[model samples]
Target chain A: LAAVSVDCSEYPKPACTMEYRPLCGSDNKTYGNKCNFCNAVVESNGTLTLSHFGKC
Target chain B: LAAVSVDCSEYPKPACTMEYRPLCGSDNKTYGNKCNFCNAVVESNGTLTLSHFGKC
Candidate 1:
């Protein structure tokens, strides 16, 4: 997760789009933000579900 | 920075984009991502200029 869509008719703000990549982890596979709490939440049957669109 | 694009008449795939946020810092104020080398680069006259588009 790194670059969200800004040209869409929807989300057109600097802070309105979804929080794509967490600013704490390196792997883009982690859920939510980063991988800081990935291990602890693994017991909840948690898995990253990534989704997005657009370009640079 | 975490979700590129998948729409538009162009870039229909999920590739070719900019590395928005770095996977390290928390504040959306850092230049790259996280807040590691900010101090050392202070003398370089640098400041995080947050920019974006529409809403979420």
Candidate 2:
């Protein structure tokens, strides 16, 4: 998923630009952006790890 | 990471509990909670897909 250029000014966190920084998570899935994917890591308390870069 | 029980009361979106509903994203990463995972999907505009519902 490519990070959409949505205004995150009103969001609790900073808005992420539409960057396609694909990352592979430990779950064997691919995340479109690093921002969204990184958030999952924090939410998961580091349980979620970046398996690699690009589509899995 | 296990979903930590953080108060999203003041956050932009609703708070997600510390429940562990593991989800495998298309990026090969495992998300701890569906809320965090879904946000990534929206941010990525569907580039990230849910591969499954559990730890990868």
Candidate 3:
């Protein structure tokens, strides 16, 4: 996964745009502009990241 | 990181216990019971998971 830009209208502040999208399944993931900790576990390997075209 | 039990008072439910802890820099990360998608990308190797000893 990558840091898919959710929004930056309020740069320097949490725009509340970043979010996580589980690539393995329809799981409710979490993110903050990017998957900064994407490689912290096993099951989370090889997941995908897509922009916040919409909400979770 | 590990699935640190924040609370099991509501098992079968989210319990609000699960969470993600990054191994790298002291950055604000995400989680949900577990790092279900931590190994998805990079900059997230060997993270840690601490229970909600307290809230963020």
Candidate 4:
């Protein structure tokens, strides 16, 4: 399946609540959520992407 | 360093309390503690072993 793309600014603050949905990112690191993953993408100009849905 | 071998029967009950030590077992799975890992090892007749001290 195609990777899910998330726009960081569009994510609701309430949904950003802490949870342990492990995700693997393009940088070969695991993120706690897509919220964090997208935050990195926004910070790095999309340099960091969600490469997989689970831990790398 | 060599891997630690623990006999579950000798492990103290108080030490089995919840904590995130993140141990990697010889079965290639992450466990929450040496106590939990050792208990699993005892269950399987030492077939399961402690491969490392951290997550896999």
DockQ for every model, please: 0.11, 0.03, 0.03, 0.01
**Model 1 C-alpha lDDT per residue in residues A1-56, reported as the tens digit of each score:** 33322232232233432324322122233333223223323433434222321111
TM-score of decoy 4: 0.39
Whose TM-score is higher: candidate 2's or candidate 4's? 4
TM-score of each: 0.17, 0.37, 0.17, 0.39
Over B1-56, each residue of candidate 4 has an lDDT whose tens digit, in order, gives 11112345665354546324455577889867666776677678857865544557
Local accuracy of candidate 2 as per-residue lDDT tens digits, B1-55: 3332222112223455633576677788987776666656645633666666677
RMSD of each: 15.0, 14.4, 15.4, 14.7
lDDT of 3 by residue, A2-51 (tens): 33332211122223233254322124443332222222222343233332
Q: Which pairs of residues collide in candidate 4? A: none
User: How close to the true structure is residue A38 of candidate 1, measured as C-alpha lDDT?
Assistant: 36
Give the CA lDDT, 0 to 100, for residue A37 in model 4: 65
Error of 4 at B18 (Å): 3.4
DockQ of 1: 0.11
Fnat of each prediction? 0.20, 0.00, 0.00, 0.00
**Which docking class does model 3 fall in?**
incorrect
State the lDDT at B10 in candidate 1.
Answer: 24
Ordered from best to worst lDDT, the candidate numbers read 4, 2, 3, 1
TM-score of chain B of 3: 0.20
lDDT of 2 by residue, A1-56 (tens): 22212222233335756324565678887767666666666677747765544557
